[PDB]
Design a protein around this ligand. Structure first.
Ligand code: 925
Ligand code: CA
Length: 264
């Protein structure tokens, strides 16, 4: 997994974030790759590398593939390259905008497919959102960013108190109690789905995070997004059941979604 840093040539910078940059580059000359670099101090090298250690365990076509690491500062994680970058952004590009509901549903089923694998392997992602989905040059999607991912032996993960999460994507039980499960990711997927029909629009447009929390306590869910197919909205609804155990599996989601876009 470890390789010389001299085997890479960084070309374009793609993002920067609090914890480091993402680069488009070349490995051993002819291979296009993505390179994630760590900001010396944003977190320990091991903490950064923990993502790689995990990608070694979670390999699947529908999941971004780890290539190698450079374990001397600046630390690098080197991976498969996704030409179209982040799904939130791509959906807004001239290409993404012209995408038919049929293709969007296809992309949704691909994401559920990857999560089903993650589910099968007893992992949780905990950060499932459109930003963390990457699009290839053939418009296939792969899950990425397993920084918050966790192996769940006893059905549930209990977040370190003081941990802050994207309220609008996070399941209530996780927000209020800090308890995460795959059912908790299923909730995030529902929010992801809205993010797909609205071509990368923020969930709960115009609302504050506390506003959202209160509404969910009242039993409200997100208002029907504009131009959202009703059958898709109701599937979005399953993901949002009050009881985590009543939310469906990712394999059920895939199956239905595959049905939805086969029906168009
Ligand atoms: C050149 C340009 C303007 C780049 C654009 N992408 C971006 O701006 C962009 C911005 C931020 C991130 C990424 C991107 C692409 C990609 N692949 C593979 C892997 C990663 N990361 C990564 C790596 C390891 C772990 C992880 O958890 C994420 N990443 N990260 C791309 C896309 C278009 C406009 C078509 N093209 O034309
Ligand atoms: Ca375009």
């Amino acid at each position: 997994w470890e390789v010389p840093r001299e085997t890479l040539k960084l070309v374009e910078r793609l993002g920067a974030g609090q914890f480091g940059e993402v680069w488009m580059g070349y490995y051993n000359g002819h291979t296009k790759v993505a390179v994630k670099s760590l900001k010396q101090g944003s977190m320990s090298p091991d903490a950064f590398l923990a993502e790689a250690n995990l990608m070694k365990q979670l390999q699947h076509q529908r999941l971004v593939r780890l290539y190698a690491v450079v374990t001397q500062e600046p630390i690098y994680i080197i991976t498969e390259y996704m030409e179209n970058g982040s799904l939130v952004d791509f959906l807004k590009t001239p290409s993404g905008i012209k995408l038919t509901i049929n293709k969007l549903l296809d992309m949704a089923a691909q994401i559920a497919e990857g999560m089903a694998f993650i589910e099968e392997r007893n992992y949780i992602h905990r950060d499932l959102r459109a930003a963390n989905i990457l699009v290839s040059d053939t418009l296939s999607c792969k899950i990425a960013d397993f920084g918050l991912a966790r192996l769940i032996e006893d059905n549930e993960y209990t977040a370190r108190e003081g941990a802050k999460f994207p309220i609008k994507w996070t399941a209530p039980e996780a927000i209020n109690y800090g308890t995460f499960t795959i059912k908790s990711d299923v909730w995030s997927f529902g929010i992801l789905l809205t993010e797909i029909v609205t071509h990368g629009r923020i969930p709960y447009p115009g609302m504050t995070n506390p506003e959202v929390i209160q509404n969910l306590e009242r039993g409200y869910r997100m208002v029907r997004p504009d131009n959202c197919p009703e059958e898709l909205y109701q599937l979005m609804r399953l993901c949002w059941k009050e009881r985590p155990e009543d939310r469906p599996t990712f394999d059920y989601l895939r199956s239905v979604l595959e049905d939805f876009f086969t029906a168009t």
